[PDB]
């Protein structure tokens, strides 16, 4: 693993909010998978409409 700070490349004075991650997903990460599903989970009794 090679990791280095990117203050020169990926840092903006106004605030970089471009990186987002996901909450809900049913299946586990199978080896060598790329899934772009947009399913929203019904994790309770009130449906998410």
């Amino acid at each position, epitope marked *: 693993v090679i990791a280095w700070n990117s203050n020169n490349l990926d840092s903006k004075v106004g605030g970089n909010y471009n990186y987002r991650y996901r909450l809900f997903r049913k299946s586990n990460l199978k080896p060598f998978e790329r899934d772009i599903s947009t399913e929203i989970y019904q994790a309770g*009794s009130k449906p998410c409409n």
Partner: antibody, heavy 118, light 106 residues
Framework: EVQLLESGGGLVQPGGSLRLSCAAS????????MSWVRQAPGKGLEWVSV???????YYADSVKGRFTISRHNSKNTLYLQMNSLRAEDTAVYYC????????????WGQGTTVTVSS | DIVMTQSPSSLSASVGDRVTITCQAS??????LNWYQQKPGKAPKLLIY???NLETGVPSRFSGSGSGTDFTFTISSLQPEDIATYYC?????????FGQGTKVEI
């Protein structure tokens, strides 16, 4: 429909086995976040353990090897058998459906206390 | 690890006085602190999340603010229902240790 009920707790002695359990309905413990947390008397909340999606177990510092966690989707239940306990473990424990970082512990139940007095 | 050294733990005041709660942290919390209402003996109830947004149900007499090292909680209209212990929590650096909370009793 959705509900997280608590079972277990009592007056087990230090080093004595006990079983705490959180039975869920409406969610899936195996493929979603869930957690157990303690609250000591006279002290603030203390994180205990989490179960993630993908078979990855993470615990706190003091419960790294003293608790045993196992999950089942047959009734959507999480079980923690605790052995080799300590006297300080007397505290009010909660099972929570923590949903990452959008406000911690937004939803609360009742919670059950565990006294480890001799 | 992020640990908060909050100076006040139990402050007593008369009826109608303002409530100002300051929670200092060792490291910078990035818009990621919460304010709860826990009440004497009752379970904590979350009011302020993500340091800027209000939850539906929270009374207008409660306010929370902060983005960085400094975090503030303000109550202008003092009520007997506000006798409680307000906690500051940082869900920012793993492990997410909880705060001690300052106890206001009138």
């Amino acid at each position: 429909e959705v509900q997280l009920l608590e079972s277990g707790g009592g007056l087990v002695q230090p080093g004595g086995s006990l079983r705490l359990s959180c039975a869920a309905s409406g969610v899936t413990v195996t493929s979603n976040y869930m957690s157990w947390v303690r609250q000591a008397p006279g002290k603030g909340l203390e994180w205990v353990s989490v179960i993630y999606s993908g078979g990855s177990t993470y615990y706190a510092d003091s419960v790294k090897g003293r608790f045993t966690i196992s999950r089942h989707n047959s009734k959507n239940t999480l079980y923690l058998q605790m052995n080799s306990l300590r006297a300080e473990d007397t505290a009010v424990y909660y099972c929570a459906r923590d949903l990452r970082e959008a406000g911690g512990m937004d939803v609360w139940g009742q919670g059950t206390t565990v006294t480890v007095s001799s | 690890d992020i640990v908060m050294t909050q100076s006040p733990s139990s402050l007593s005041a008369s009826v109608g006085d303002r409530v100002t709660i300051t929670c200092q942290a060792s490291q910078d919390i990035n818009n990621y602190l919460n304010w709860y209402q826990q009440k004497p003996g009752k379970a904590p109830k979350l009011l302020i999340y993500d340091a800027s947004n209000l939850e539906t149900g929270v009374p207008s007499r409660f306010s929370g603010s902060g983005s960085g090292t400094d975090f503030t909680f303000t109550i202008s209209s003092l009520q007997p229902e506000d006798i409680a212990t307000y906690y500051c929590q940082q869900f920012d650096n793993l492990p997410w240790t909880f705060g001690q909370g300052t106890k206001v009793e009138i």
